[PDB]
Amino acid sequence: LPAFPREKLTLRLLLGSGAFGEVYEGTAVDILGVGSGEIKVAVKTLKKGSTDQEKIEFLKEAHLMSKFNHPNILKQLGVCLLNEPQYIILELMEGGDLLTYLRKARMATFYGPLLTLVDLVDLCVDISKGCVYLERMHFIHRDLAARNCLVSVKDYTSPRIVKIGDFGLPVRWMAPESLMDGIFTTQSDVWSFGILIWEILTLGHQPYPAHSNLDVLNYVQTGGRLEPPRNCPDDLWNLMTQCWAQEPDQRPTFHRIQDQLQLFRNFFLNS
Numbered sequence: 001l002p003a004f005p006r007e008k009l010t011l012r013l014l015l016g017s018g019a020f021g022e023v024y025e026g027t028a029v030d031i032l033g034v035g036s037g038e039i040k041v042a043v044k045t046l047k048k049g050s051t052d053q054e055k056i057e058f059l060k061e062a063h064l065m066s067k068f069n070h071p072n073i074l075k076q077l078g079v080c081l082l083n084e085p086q087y088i089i090l091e092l093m094e095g096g097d098l099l100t101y102l103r104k105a106r107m108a109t110f111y112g113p114l115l116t117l118v119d120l121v122d123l124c125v126d127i128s129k130g131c132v133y134l135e136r137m138h139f140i141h142r143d144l145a146a147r148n149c150l151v152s153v154k155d156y157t158s159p160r161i162v163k164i165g166d167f168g169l170p171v172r173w174m175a176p177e178s179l180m181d182g183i184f185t186t187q188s189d190v191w192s193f194g195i196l197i198w199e200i201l202t203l204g205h206q207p208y209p210a211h212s213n214l215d216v217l218n219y220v221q222t223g224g225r226l227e228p229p230r231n232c233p234d235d236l237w238n239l240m241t242q243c244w245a246q247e248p249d250q251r252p253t254f255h256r257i258q259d260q261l262q263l264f265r266n267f268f269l270n271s
């Protein structure tokens, strides 16, 4: 657990209060090493006067986050758990959640979307590399969706990186086995990854839009799948359908998904 002195941490603005207590944008000194300097950070706080039951949950969250060191997984830089309020220090993803970033790219201008197909494919590659790491760690996320991913930039012209954020009812993202049997495997995360790349390729559309949570479980259990995104490339729709195979055993691995996305990216770039 990366113990960090709260004296080297400064809280500057409030990002929100949708987790344990509040999330702050701040700065940390020497968090990446003694002479590294001041770096921008996100700070997950646990409210002072929190119950023992809440402290243990915060401690669990810090233990899970300490296991992840990958460019496409949100990184925990340090923790302040000796005193109250408790802090979980994270790398700052200034662009916010991927769903909002996608929706704003579609709904901002008249000329066209602020994200091209090649920008979208690179978002899929970034997420799939994060999933390969998780599959290798034998970690099952349980909630892979665009709302649970973060973007490093807020603009649409700078180089960007998408990271898998907060770790796991979200019915539209759940595979059929999770819905009826409560089975949660890396192959059910593969189902969710296909839902997330559909979200990316539609620039933030809600899956199964005409349907409700009860209609979704009925429709999906009986073989019904999402309609293809408008002008979606064939090889991307091929991989999306592979991810939604009724049997988890028939669904491809994350290592295969990364290769197929990489092969499509090369096939697309050569044209």
Ligand SMILES: Cc1cc(Nc2nccs2)nc(N2CCC[C@H]2c2cc(-c3nccnc3C)no2)n1
Pocket: 015, 016, 017, 018, 023, 042, 090, 091, 092, 093, 094, 095, 096, 097, 147, 148, 149, 150, 164, 165, 166
């Ligand atoms: C414009 C911005 C940037 C940012 N950046 C962050 N960077 C790191 C953690 S939060 N956060 C935010 N927020 C708005 C709500 C509160 C805070 C937030 C979002 C997340 C998050 N989201 C998706 C997946 N996983 C996580 C942990 N956590 O706090 N708005």
